[PDB]
Design a binder for this molecule. Structure first.
Ligand SMILES: Cc1cc(C)c(NC(=O)CO)c(C)c1
Ligand SMILES: [Zn+2]
Length: 140
């Protein structure tokens, strides 16, 4: 589980979005596993605006923050899960690291702020949904 809180926006894994998230939906993209809902109060997380390929993510399944290299966001084939059938996930970054279904929502951060959230796993590789192209999160 886990969310980014920037301005009056809340960014979650589409598959872990609540009734209130959908009820207060701003934007979702199933192919990205992303959803943004409107929030009553202001968030404090800074979104990275950068082409960083190194950072630290939180892995709840190890209660540990792992420094990682990660690939640039790309269209990648992701095997079937509880929430999506075997499909091509867009805006996805891969690193070598541990990832279990419940690690979705763990933040990936570089020196600039939040790069994305854990979205995929398996075969000793963690996948993060990029949010750095969503410029509109830094305004209204
Ligand atoms: C955090 C996380 C971990 C794993 C193993 C998976 N599974 C897949 O990659 C697809 O089957 C998903 C969706 C999320
Ligand atoms: Zn950066």
């Amino acid at each position: 589980s886990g969310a980014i809180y920037v301005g009056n926006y809340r960014v979650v894994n589409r598959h872990l979005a609540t009734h209130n998230d959908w009820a207060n939906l701003v934007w979702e993209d199933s192919s990205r596993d992303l959803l943004v809902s409107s929030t009553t109060a202001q968030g404090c997380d800074t979104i990275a605006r950068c082409d960083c390929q190194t950072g630290v993510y939180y892995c709840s399944s190890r209660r540990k923050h792992y420094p990682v290299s990660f690939s640039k966001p790309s269209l990648i084939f992701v095997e079937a899960s509880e929430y999506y059938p075997a499909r091509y996930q867009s805006h996805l970054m891969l690193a070598v690291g541990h990832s279990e279904p419940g690690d979705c929502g763990g933040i990936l951060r570089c020196q600039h702020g939040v790069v994305g959230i854990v979205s995929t796993g398996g075969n000793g590789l963690v996948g993060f949904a990029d949010v750095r192209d969503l410029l509109w999160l830094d305004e209204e």
